[PDB]
């Protein structure tokens, strides 16, 4: 789906740049496709300016596509990602947790199940600790225990939470031998470093590109299955330059410029990182505004303008090791009465 990939990758890099702005020296890990899917799911219930802002913020061109086409594209993406595979473990789920007394349009719950694969689970948010545990347990189950505390605070007056998770567990096509993993320096800056387990591979023929425009080295490592990873190594003090130039155009240039090279040695740390985010500020910066205000129009959920978003949260974890990679993420959209 080229039209979906183009919007979703534009959104990915717009998000990345805003995430870095907030905390410039911190690790970053997030799932763009989880956030895109969760906000597309939200847009199923959105109307008028609330809907336009969400779909524009997700980087769709609304002069050239329809909401109907977008939802069908996410339905197809979800079906493709959840297809059976012996090579790679990949799963994505959506759910809605809703106060039982809230009246939902039949069209909304039917469309949520058909397009996003979402059930509607009756949740008593006035029993806030129990509602929090239920939602966190759903995410824990979908992520094989890797995302445990997506929901930290949860208002007792919440009416609905929309949730997306993604789980990814893959083997390297060329796995590292743990006998070649040795504690080595990782330079936090030119004169400060920490010791990390540094994995290595010898005489490895992989796609490689030395980017002289951005002063960085790009390699692609494959997982068994259809997935791969671009690793980009800026020269020292060139990370900000590479970040400033991240874009769909740049990624396309990198992909178009790779050539196979037999690398003498590749050194890659074994590591695990995690991050959690309150995405309200970034989504407002991307122009998704009305959904958060008392002007919100989520009347495709209920038939009335009686709901508004309170928070969008995201948590993601990345584990890289000799045999492969495990990564997971989840996004929740918390919704209150208006």
């Amino acid at each position: 789906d080229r039209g979906l990939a183009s919007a979703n990758v534009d959104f990915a890099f717009s998000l990345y740049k805003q995430l870095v702005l907030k905390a410039p020296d911190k690790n970053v890990i997030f799932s763009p496709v989880s956030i895109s899917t969760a906000l597309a799911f939200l847009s199923l219930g959105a109307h008028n300016t609330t809907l336009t802002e969400i779909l524009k913020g997700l980087k769709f061109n609304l002069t050239e596509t329809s909401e109907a086409e977008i939802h069908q594209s996410f339905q197809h993406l979800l079906r493709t990602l959840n297809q059976s595979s012996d090579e790679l473990q990949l799963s994505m789920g959506n759910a809605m947790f809703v106060k039982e007394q809230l009246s939902l349009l039949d069209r909304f719950t039917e469309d949520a199940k058909r397009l996003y694969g979402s059930e509607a689970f009756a949740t008593d948010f006035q029993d806030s600790a129990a509602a929090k545990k239920l939602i966190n347990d759903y995410v824990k189950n979908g992520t094989r225990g890797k995302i445990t505390d997506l929901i930290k605070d949860l208002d007792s007056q919440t009416m609905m939470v929309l949730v997306n998770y993604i789980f990814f567990k893959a083997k390297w096509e060329m796995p590292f031998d743990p006998q070649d993993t040795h504690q080595s320096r990782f330079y936090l800056s030119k004169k400060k470093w920490v010791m990390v387990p540094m994995m290595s591979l010898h005489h490895l023929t992989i796609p490689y590109f030395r980017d002289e425009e951005l002063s960085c080295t790009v390699v692609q490592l494959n997982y068994t299955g259809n997935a791969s990873v671009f690793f980009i190594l800026p020269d020292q003090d060139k990370m900000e330059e590479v970040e400033a130039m991240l874009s769909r155009e740049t990624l396309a240039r990198w992909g178009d410029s790779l050539e196979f090279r037999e690398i003498g040695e590749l050194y890659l740390p074994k590591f695990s990182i995690s991050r959690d985010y309150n995405l309200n500020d970034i989504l407002l910066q991307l122009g998704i505004e009305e959904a958060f205000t008392s002007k919100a129009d989520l009347s495709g959920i209920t038939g009335a303008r009686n709901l508004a978003v309170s928070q969008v949260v995201h948590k993601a974890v990345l584990d890289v090791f000799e045999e492969g990679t495990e990564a997971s993420a989840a996004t929740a959209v918390k919704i209150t009465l208006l």
């Binding site: 789906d1 990939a5 998000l15 690790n27 990782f186 540094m198 791969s228 990873v229 740390p269 993420a329």
Partner: protein, 35 residues
């Protein structure tokens, strides 16, 4: 002499699907042991 690629300073990772062209995950690793 063969090229060495040594990820011992901050780097980026973009996990992609060749079938759907989705970006599953994007990361910047500035400190693998960052608190």
């Amino acid at each position: 002499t063969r090229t060495i690629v040594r990820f011992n300073r901050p780097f980026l990772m973009i996990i992609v699907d060749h079938f759907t062209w989705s970006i599953f995950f994007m990361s910047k690793v500035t400190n693998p042991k960052q608190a």
